[PDB]
Amino acid sequence: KHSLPDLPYDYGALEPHINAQIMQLHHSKHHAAYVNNLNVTEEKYQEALAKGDVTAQIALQPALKFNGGGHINHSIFWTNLSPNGGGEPKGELLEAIKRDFGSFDKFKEKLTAASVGVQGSGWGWLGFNKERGHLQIAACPNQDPLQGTTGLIPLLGIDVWEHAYYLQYKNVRPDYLKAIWNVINWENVTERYMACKK
Amino acid sequence: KHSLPDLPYDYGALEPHINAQIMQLHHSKHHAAYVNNLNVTEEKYQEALAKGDVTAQIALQPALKFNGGGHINHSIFWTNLSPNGGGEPKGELLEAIKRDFGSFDKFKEKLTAASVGVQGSGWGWLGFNKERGHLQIAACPNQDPLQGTTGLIPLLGIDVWEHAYYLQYKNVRPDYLKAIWNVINWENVTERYMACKK
Amino acid sequence: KHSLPDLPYDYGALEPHINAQIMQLHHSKHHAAYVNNLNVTEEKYQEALAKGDVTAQIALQPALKFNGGGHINHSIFWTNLSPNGGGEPKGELLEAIKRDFGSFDKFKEKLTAASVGVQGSGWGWLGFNKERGHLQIAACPNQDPLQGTTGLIPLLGIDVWEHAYYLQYKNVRPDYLKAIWNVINWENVTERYMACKK
Amino acid sequence: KHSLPDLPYDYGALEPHINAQIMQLHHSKHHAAYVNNLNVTEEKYQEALAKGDVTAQIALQPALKFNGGGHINHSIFWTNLSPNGGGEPKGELLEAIKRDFGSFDKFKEKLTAASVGVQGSGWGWLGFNKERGHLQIAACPNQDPLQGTTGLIPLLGIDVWEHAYYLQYKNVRPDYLKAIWNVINWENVTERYMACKK
Ligand SMILES: [Mn+2]
Ligand SMILES: [Mn+2]
Ligand SMILES: [Mn+2]
Ligand SMILES: [Mn+2]
């Protein structure tokens, strides 16, 4: 059984880019629902697997994918954001961005374009293609995890679900992205790239 | 080139079930963006078709589907809601609900379950299966139109996109559905069933 | 661990509608591969679930769905076909077809149209919608099981995968369907409807 | 209105890797059906677009995608195969394979794995990611074109549809791939890379 990961920072840490209400509602309601439904799906699905009902497993596949992907995506998202984060990434990760996207601003605009291009709910991901050994930009609809679906190891995540920004930015998602670029925890992305690149 | 259909009722007509801010933002921003992107996609796609580029047409298919389905779905949605609407449908449509779902409350709970079951963005639809000649409950993700995709002629539509209810009901979609059941324009659904059943 | 179900009839029973080579290759190779890959996916996926890796489970979901659906679909398919089968279904199932499709020939042409309409690999299904309590015609791509995906309890199945008919009928699938209508085991479909309707 | 492209080589040119029957049936039946259905879909869809029926366009989208993608994919496939082709690619394309996949044999095994991994019908593609400027391996189900869907400009294509190999290799697709590696027209792939890389 999974558990809800506590935020490393208080709800009002992301002022004013993300107001306290959005963080509070997001974490305490949407991620909590994801983890609770994940636990329910896990217990039902495990008893189905023990019974040996393939039809039941295939029926439960969408719910398990949705809840587990939501949990994983939001767990990555919370770590990816810091009150102290933002600005310009440093170290080998910056060089990787330079050699894969030409410049950091080009990476910013490409990730912003990918995030806005998500029709409906979804996620915009910066991930390390380990087999090819280079950074990539992806967009995954709904709560589809990056590593589970595409195989790319996730480094940076942007939640373009409407619950992430509607209470503050209404329909202008580009403003939400421009703001969230100020709270990215580039140190955590550096740790993820170090652990992934290795 | 398509145009944005004006609301038959003012923005504050749906008080208090749907506050004025949600109706105003929805109609003036989301549907306007859908119709504008639909016009852009139509002109680009028509010049591509005249040129005879199948690859360009297949590339433009997702954008055309998204924008056109959004326009159609919201155009149906605005007519489906009335300040005077709500309560209990009358006439042959009520008998059709009785003979297809057992009772009107059973239809209400089935449509509510279908609408809540939409993972992410989507739409919950009551539609007349014309070939089989009976009412059906469907759920279509994102802005997929009912008639275009499933072939069911749409009668009643519920927008479970987060922009439809987040500013008022936050994460509890069931409360949004319970409220929207008070503003359903059953007379327009009766007209749609008469024109469809015929 | 699952096992390959033996055919109730020998390979050459379906002469001349389905030649012995197609039945032999189908059962001994395609279904055997499905069940073997299903066993492998089950063991890998069960150890992943015991470990508690949601990402691994979501990664293994497509393979499990493909193999398990192939196994279930072919297990239903083998029972649905009999050397003695064919002709005109008798009993309450015939009345159900009459009241849901108008006539048996209308059901035949509707199921044939659904089977031919499958773009690529897939399956054409006659299934009892238990909640609505009436027969329905569905088409499921690749090896997607009917009950697992759509919830319809499967009664009759038609494999429109190219391995089912290419060695004999080449590209004309309609001839394959017209032939397979002579070997349908309507008694087994009657048993399935009795067990389902109940 | 599109037309069926004639084969640059006679039907029996690919002996013994691809027998004359497979080439004859493939080109004269499957691709002919694709182009005919593409013409029908184009005329219906163009009159729908002129009428201004978005629902009709969205309904016709799947058929247009299927037929047009089939036509494009098979038109690329016929050029990609030559009686004189096979062996080891020469020139800058070989260096591109070396720098993107490590060695030519690694590219061969990766493309073979991608082609076999296609569950059901599909296509395995070697394509130049123009934005990132490097070669990539992709798999597209059914008749989905590479450039239309993923944006990768197609260079080499492998038809893993069962009509491509079932009459000769039955269920062992790996043998079909090992054989088709002897008839790849690397000169045409070099031309495609030159025109794409530019
Ligand atoms: Mn979220
Ligand atoms: Mn809406
Ligand atoms: Mn089969
Ligand atoms: Mn082909």
Numbering used by the authors:
A (entry chain A), B (entry chain C), C (entry chain B), D (entry chain D): 25 to 222
Study authors write:
Here we report the use of single particle cryo-EM to identify multiple proteins from three enriched heterogeneous fractions prepared from human liver mitochondrial lysate. Functionally, the three acyl-CoA dehydrogenases—SCAD, MCAD and IVD—are involved in beta oxidation and amino acid catabolism. Finally, SOD2, CAT, and ALDH2 are all involved in clearing toxic byproducts of oxidative respiration.
Our BaR methodology classified a total of 50,014 single particle projections for the SOD2 class. The global architecture of SOD2 is a homotetramer formed by a dimer of dimers. Similarly to existing crystal structures, each subunit of SOD2 contains an N-terminal domain primarily consisting of two long α helices and a C-terminal domain made up of a core three stranded β sheet flanked by a set of six α helices. A central cavity is formed by the interface of each subunit’s β-sheet core, while dimer interfaces consist of α-helical bundles from the N-terminal domains. Specifically, this cavity is formed by the H50 and H98 from the N-terminal domain and D183 and H187 from the C-terminal domain.
